[PDB]
Amino acid sequence: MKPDETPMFDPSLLKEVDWSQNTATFSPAISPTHPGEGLVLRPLCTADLNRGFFKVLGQLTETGVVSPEQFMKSFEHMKKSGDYYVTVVEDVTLGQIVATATLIIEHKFIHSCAKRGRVEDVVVSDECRGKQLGKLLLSTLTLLSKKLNCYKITLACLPQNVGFYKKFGYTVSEENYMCRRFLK
Amino acid sequence: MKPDETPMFDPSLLKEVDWSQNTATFSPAISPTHPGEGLVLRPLCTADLNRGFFKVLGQLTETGVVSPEQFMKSFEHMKKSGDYYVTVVEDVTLGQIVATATLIIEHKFIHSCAKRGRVEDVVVSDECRGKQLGKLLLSTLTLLSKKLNCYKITLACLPQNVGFYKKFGYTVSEENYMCRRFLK
Ligand SMILES: [Cl-]
Ligand SMILES: [Cl-]
């Protein structure tokens, strides 16, 4: 209908992550509960359409042209499933999104009907890169996936960024990542 | 409640795939509509619990111990989302599943709120490896993802199996596949 402040998921899930199990180094110490001065770590809401969500996302990959209807349809579907955790950092002093990252829960029949996590669409605004938000997002979502009882969590990255993800307990798999982009 | 014959998705979706766009070689010619004598290519149903679904799946990876309640809960969630296409081949002369493969539709905000495909949990029974079922499953699901308007489709595989997936238009990505299995 109209963009609003309704969160995609329960915001308490981020704060109730067992932060003692974080393995990334934070200087100064920040947490999901206290991400830094003037900042809030929270689920995406549809009103964020007008808070520079696509400006941040567009720094990572093309977002093309998006209508409010397109965005809200997509958001509502992600919300309904209960399996999408699109997470943002808002600078409340600006009223603008400065970082985002997504956790997706995928359901399986293998490993006794296991769940597995996927980390996607991670980007911190280029003007906001000294606030440790990338580490905060990855650690929080990785810990959240463990809280949600995932058997494993995976992601893809270019070689130069392997070192970053190793900080959260990820290792390079033996498996190759293969892709087909539909040109027709 | 009780295992039954209800399909996870509309079975016509597999048959209405544009089979002329297949790029894998089939000798003899088989299709989603006519997969081979005594065979049916169809969505998973809960009754397949008693048709060797986990026997086939267990050849790929550990399935551990699974209850009927666990299986049906997992199945019903996958069905409700509309984004899970767990597909099987049943030998109707035996009443047994002989192959399976999964297409998952993941929803994004990037690329004008795009959808992207994921191929997972592909396995053909070890006693049934001369019936071209692997190629049939991969081509059908790859074409189905295109029909469902996915921007791209991805999967992971070990190096020795790259050649197989190249038959359906997949190429090795520049990105590394990274993983964390939760030991705690
Ligand atoms: Cl898993
Ligand atoms: Cl995509």
What is the residue type of A134? Answer: G
- Is residue B91 domain-resident? yes
Of the candidates B73, B89, B68, which has an alpha carbon nearest to the alpha carbon of residue B140? B89
| Beta-carbon pairs below 8 A across chains A and B | 190
- Is residue B26 domain-resident? yes
- Is residue B177 domain-resident? no
Alpha-carbon gap, residue A173 to B29, rounded angstroms: 36
Q: Is B61 annotated as a binding residue?
A: yes
- Is residue A162 domain-resident? yes
- Do B99 and B123 form a contact (C-beta atoms < 8 A)? yes
Name the method of structure determination: X-ray
- Is residue A177 domain-resident? no
- Do A149 and B184 form a contact (C-beta atoms < 8 A)? no
Alpha-carbon gap, residue A132 to A124, rounded angstroms: 9
Please work out, in degrees rounded to the nearest 5, the angle formed at the alpha carbon of residue B169 by the alpha carbons of B181 and A159.
Answer: 45
Element (H, E) at A176: strand A171-181
Residue B69 φ/ψ, nearest 5 degrees? -65, -45
Residue B172 φ/ψ, nearest 5 degrees? -65, 125
Q: Which residues is A90 bridged to in the sheet? A: A40, A97
Sheet with A39-43: strands ordered across: A39-43, A84-91, A96-107, A115-124, A150-157, B171-181, A171-181, B150-157, B115-124, B96-107, B84-91, B39-43
CB contact under 8 A, A176 and B170: no
Q: HSE (CB half, 13 Å, CA atoms) of A106?
A: 28
Q: Which residues contact A183 (CB under 8 A, 6 or more apart)?
A: none
DSSP secondary-structure letter at A132?
Answer: -
Please identify among residues 12-71 of chain B the ones whose CB lies closer than 8 Å to any CB of chain A.
Answer: 21, 53-54, 57, 60-66, 70-71
Alpha-carbon gap, residue A11 to A8, rounded angstroms: 9
CB contact under 8 A, B110 and A104: no
Map tokens 């699109």 to a residue: A86
Alpha-carbon gap, residue B6 to B86, rounded angstroms: 13
Alpha-carbon gap, residue A153 to A178, rounded angstroms: 18
Of the candidates A48, A31, A132, which has an alpha carbon nearest to the alpha carbon of residue A86? A48
Residue A51, classed as helix, strand or coil, is coil
Alpha-helical segments (H) within B18-147:
53-57, 68-81, 110-113, 133-147
Is any Cβ of chain B less than 8 angstroms from the Cβ of A165? Answer: yes
- Is residue B4 domain-resident? no
- Do B164 and B134 form a contact (C-beta atoms < 8 A)? yes
* B64: nearest CA partner in chain A: A112
The tokens describing A28, both together, are 């100064």
Closest-approaching ligand to the CA atom of A118: 1
What is the residue type of B92? Answer: V
- Residue ranges for the known binding site of A for acetyl-CoA are 130-135, 165-167
**Closest chain A C-alpha to B138 CA, distance in angstroms:** 12
**Closest chain A C-alpha to B60 CA, distance in angstroms:** 9
Closest-approaching ligand to the CA atom of A114: 1
- Is residue B109 domain-resident? yes
- Do B64 and A109 form a contact (C-beta atoms < 8 A)? no
Q: HSE (CB half, 13 Å, CA atoms) of B66?
A: 25
The tokens describing B138, both together, are 């991969």
The tokens describing A124, both together, are 């911190």
- Do B173 and A184 form a contact (C-beta atoms < 8 A)? no
Instruction: Give the CATH number of the domain where residue B70 resides.
Output: 3.40.630.30
Alpha-carbon gap, residue B118 to B109, rounded angstroms: 17
Query: Using CA of residue B120, residue B123, residue B129, residue B132, what is the dihedral sign?
Result: negative
- Do A36 and A102 form a contact (C-beta atoms < 8 A)? no
Of the candidates B170, B161, B173, which has an alpha carbon nearest to the alpha carbon of residue B60? B161
| Rg (chain B; Cα; Å) | 16
- Is residue B179 domain-resident? no
Residues in A closer than 8 angstroms to B146, CB to CB, are 182, 184
Instruction: Indicate the resolution in Å.
Output: 2.0
- Do B94 and B50 form a contact (C-beta atoms < 8 A)? no
Q: Which residues is B152 bridged to in the sheet? A: A181, B116
Map tokens 């981020």 to a residue: A14
Dihedral angle at the C-alpha atoms of A62, A67, A69, A75, nearest 10 degrees?
A: 20
Dmax (CA) for chain A in angstroms is 50
Of the candidates B184, B20, B108, B86, which has an alpha carbon nearest to the alpha carbon of residue A86? B108
Domain with A19 in it: 10-170
Map tokens 């596949």 to a residue: B177
- Domain count within chain A: 1
Element (H, E) at B85: strand B84-91
CB contact under 8 A, A176 and B172: yes
The tokens describing A76, both together, are 């509502």
Q: Which residues contact A59 (CB under 8 A, 6 or more apart)?
A: A123, A125, A126
